Amino acid sequence: GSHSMRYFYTSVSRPGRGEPRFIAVGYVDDTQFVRFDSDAASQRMEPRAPWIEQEGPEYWDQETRNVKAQSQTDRVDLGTLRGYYNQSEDGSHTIQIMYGCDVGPDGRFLRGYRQDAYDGKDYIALNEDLRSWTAADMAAQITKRKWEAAHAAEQQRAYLEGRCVEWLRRYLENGKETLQRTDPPKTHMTHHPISDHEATLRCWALGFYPAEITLTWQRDGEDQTQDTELVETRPAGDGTFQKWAAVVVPSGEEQRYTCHVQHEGLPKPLTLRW
Amino acid sequence: IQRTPKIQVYSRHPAENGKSNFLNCYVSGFHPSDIEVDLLKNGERIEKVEHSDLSFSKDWSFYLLYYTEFTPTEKDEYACRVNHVTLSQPKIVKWDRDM
Amino acid sequence: PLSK
Amino acid sequence: SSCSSC
């Protein structure tokens, strides 16, 4: 199906404790493959998936240069935005940048993204046309004007439509054994009496890849969406994910409830009943 | 604008006493990124805990996985202690084997 | 460049 | 591969 490549940058100021910290991570779909941490001893972009380790030293030097230059840029921007919002020198603040591209099943460019936050809130974003910008507030309007004048959008589009996609295709081929795998969820049910007249039914999905999944409970065929407890999909730590959904059932009525599991890895959606 | 962490504490595989496994504490939905996450065995902080590289979701909120290899027993209690600016005291979340 |  | 000119 379709695939995405995404880079995530976080810069955090720490006044009177030296330089901002800068962390970069890169993902293909739900799999992380590189990181950089300005505080770590290496001062290098590092591998975090097996398939990226085949890149040679020129790759790693350039990637390292890229992220180090972004960290310096963010460093200055942290001062500028503090000024735009009239903030003291004393507080910690955060600039976050997410960018990337999506390709279809055939490998063709579907779309590109670049979006920036300040203190966890939208600041500025490249619109889907990749030629224009949306500013969240008056500070970001100042940035927008500078970026319009500097023709920022043209530089970013060229990356998103070119290198971004080309490299995503490379990685999908070189990591095909893991990136292009589906691991279907392994499912089961648990059941716990709460009293003599209520019981929890919990429906489990384990070991699945990619993260996207749907777990639903029905009673007699009727969706019990409003009475279902879901947890956020969570990492197992081995590259697969886990999720569960639970309903409190009047005791003795369990056979009326069915759990439904949809995932890309299943030839057909699974139904479970206690 | 701060956002307090969601916290899940769980094992990589369904727990079997005496079989080697991984204890996870996953924190998500939080801002700012500054946070401390400790895994506790019977109230005592485990020394050797690793964590994933800082990343964030579409809503800008951060997520991290903290983890350690372990072998559960019937006696040993585990918990995840999360320290964050949105919490006036550290939140301690016990490991339940069916959550 | 491109500075904010 | 990360962007250089961003």
Numbering used by the authors:
A (entry chain A): 1 to 274
B (entry chain B): 1 to 99
C (entry chain D): 1 to 4
D (entry chain C): 1 to 6
Quoted from the paper:
Recognition of viral antigens by CD8+ T cells requires successful folding of the major histocompatibility class I (MHC-I) molecule and β2-microglobulin (β2 m) with peptides typically 8- to 10-mer in length. The peptide binding groove of MHC-I molecule contains six binding pockets, A-F, which span and accommodate the binding peptide from the N-terminal to C-terminal. A minimum 8-mer peptide is required for structural stability of the peptide-human leukocyte antigen (pHLA) tri-complex that is contributed by two amino acid residues of the peptide that serve as “anchors”, one that fits in pockets A/B and the other in pocket F4–6. The overall structure of HLA-A*11:01 in complex with various peptides (SSCSSCPLSK, SSCPLSK or SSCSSC + SSCPLSK) is similar to the standard MHC class I molecules.
For HLA-A*11:01-SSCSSC + SSCPLSK complex, the two short peptides were clearly seen as separate entities that were ordered and displayed continuous electron density. However, insufficient electron density for the residues SSC in SSCPLSK peptide of the combitope did not allow for precise definition. Superimposing the Cα-atoms of SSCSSC from the combitope (SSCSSC + SSCPLSK) with 10-mer peptide revealed the orientation of residues to be similar in both structures with a r.m.s.d. of 0.3 Å. Overlaying the Cα-atoms of PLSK from the combitope with 10-mer peptide showed a r.m.s.d. of 1.6 Å. The P7-Pro of the combitope is flipped outwards from the antigen-binding cleft by 5.8 Å in comparison to 10-mer peptide, and the side chain of P8-Leu in the combitope is orientated in the opposite direction to the 10-mer peptide. Close examination of the combitope (SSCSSC + SSCPLSK) revealed that the N-terminal peptide, SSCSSC, has its anchor residue P2-Ser seated in B pocket of antigen-binding cleft and is held by various hydrogen and van der Waals interactions. P2-Ser interacts with residues Tyr7, Glu63 and Asn66 in a fashion similar to 10-mer peptide but without water-mediated interactions. As for the C-terminal peptide (SSCPLSK) of the combitope, it is held firmly in the antigen-binding cleft by primary anchor residue P10-Lys that makes interactions with Asp74, Asp77, Thr80, Tyr84, Asp116, Thr143 and Lys146 in a similar manner to the 10-mer peptide. However, the side chain of P10-Lys in the combitope makes an additional water-mediated interaction with residue Ala117 which likely contributed to the overall stability of the complex.
